[PDB]
């Protein structure tokens, strides 16, 4: 419970999003400790009763977890990228099958079983533990991948990466960011104050890109 | 020649009209077909439906002859009669919901996408939103309804929301556009997308 709030935030949440969630927690709760995992292992980690994790902020959806409630905290944007001379830039156009005929570089779990959300499309798949690794193989020409905006922002501008999804969803694949909280927190007014403020600031931050 | 566009009933009317007004700028014959969201993807997959475009909230990755693209967004609410048990507590999990009866859209077949598949094993199927809400008023169950379908009755007080702590403003729902691959070349289509998208975006931000 609040004694030591332990919060897990996956690596697809962007720094701005994280640092915002941090402010509000430290403002409403009074011991806070943070854990980071790739989206692969968010839900796995919180399910081990071992990990005593009170709140978890992740893009991965599991409709109902044992001890945990689900709400939607905000949104974030992810891009299909490849190397500029990759063949899927050759093609002007893409469907989700033009892709599955090529090597996808995909996040993997320590388990090896995958959410519907993080399920690879292709069967030409190759698997990596984190996004830096993923981007290293994409950058070298090995396949395509699905990464957060903030991880490919710089390299897209620089031309060292290309984007295949702008026809699919101009601006980015909008990905909900779920907040899974413990039952203990249901009752807590502080957690409800935290939802209010975080939502409101994440909203401000997110709408603020259109200035 | 005849552009057969399909539009499920979760697409708000302003959304449909925006699509009509934009197709008319680049097409001279255009058929508009409505279907429940539970039957859209089935309808296009039938081979002799000659459906060129389908606008719908239901999702699949790969469909036979069909590209996919995200056209916009829309908002949907878990609703319930106000004196329903659920209203009185606060709802933090979908497990409090699966314990009551759900008034869901039933399928022409019986198979349902992940999105439109009911939650409870306590389910009551219907064929349109009109019906789903007659029941939910009468007190029979809770259900998920397009935002426009419940706007006025949430003001009446006829009807209550259970989603507002889940996702305030409403459960954000993507509206996909599945388009025959004959359309990927044609300038007409791509300017439809560009203008439909621009207009739908102006339309959604206008709520503030
Ligand atoms: O989080 C949101 C919470 C509420 C919200 C409400 C509306 S509301 O106007 O309809 O009430 C709209 C939006 S919106 O910005 O997504 O439309 C939101 C939110 N979206 N926030 C963000 C979008 C994209 C990015 S990104 O850089 O990582 O791609 C963000 C990065 C850091 C922090 C927030 C981001
Ligand atoms: O369609 C959208 C297309 C682009 C878009 C871009 C941003 S962008 O700022 O990130 O670039 C934001 C948004 S947004 O408003 O959803 O954030 C959108 C869109 N959303 N449109 C709508 C939302 C909710 C409702 S409804 O509740 O009455 O059904 C709508 C009803 C009719 C027509 C459009 C609706
Ligand atoms: F990076 C990240 F945040 F961790 C992240 C976010 C995720 N979001 C979930 C999701 C992924 N897709 C999607 C997949 C492929 C695609 O390809 C095309 C299809 C049709 C036309 C053109 C291209 C377009 C969309 N949509 N939603 C998933 C994984 N990883
Ligand atoms: F109306 C409509 F557009 F046709 C439509 C849209 C759909 N969208 C898909 C979807 C539905 N849910 C969702 C389901 C229940 C829910 O209940 C709670 C859970 C936890 C806390 C509180 C309440 C919250 C969210 N999330 N995504 C699906 C079907 N039908
Ligand atoms: Mg949005």
Author numbering:
A (entry chain A): 91 to 301
B (entry chain B): 93 to 300
Publication text:
The eponymous PQS (Pseudomonas quinolone signal, 2‐heptyl‐3‐hydroxy‐4(1H)‐quinolone) and its biosynthetic precursor HHQ (2‐heptyl‐4‐quinolone) are both QS auto‐inducers acting as agonists on the transcriptional regulator PqsR (also referred to as MvfR). Among the various possible drug targets, PqsR is particularly attractive, as it is the essential transcriptional regulator of the PQS QS system serving major functions in PA virulence. Blocking this receptor results in affecting a number of down‐stream regulated processes such as virulence‐factor production, e.g., pyocyanin, biofilm formation or eDNA secretion. Due to its central role in virulence regulation, PqsR has been investigated in various studies as a promising new target for treating PA infections. It has been shown that small molecular agents, which act as inverse agonists on PqsR and thus inhibit QS, are able to reduce the production of the important virulence factor pyocyanin and the auto‐inducing alkylquinolones.
It became evident that the para‐substitution motif was suitable for growing. This was surprising, as this direction seemed to be occluded by residues Ile186 and Leu189 in the X‐ray structure and modeled binding mode. Nevertheless, we installed a number of substituents having various chemical properties in this 4‐position (shown in derivatives 9–15). Indeed, this attempt proved successful, as we discovered phenoxy‐modified compound 4, which showed a highly improved potency at IC50 of 11 × 10−9 m. The exploited growth vector was further endorsed by a co‐crystal structure of 4 in complex with the ligand binding domain of the transcriptional regulator PqsR91‐319. Herein, we observed the opening of an additional pocket upon binding. The para‐installed phenoxy moiety causes a 4 Å movement of Ile186 as measured by α‐carbon distance. Such observations of receptor flexibility and induced fit reshaping of the ligand‐binding site are fascinating and likely the reason for the observed non‐additive SAR. Optimized lead QSI 4 demonstrated high potency, suitable PK for pulmonary applications, a favorable safety pharmacology profile and was well tolerated in mice. In a murine lung‐infection model with a mucoid PA isolate, we successfully demonstrated the target engagement of the QSI 4 by recording a significant reduction of the proximal biomarkers HHQ, PQS, and HQNO.
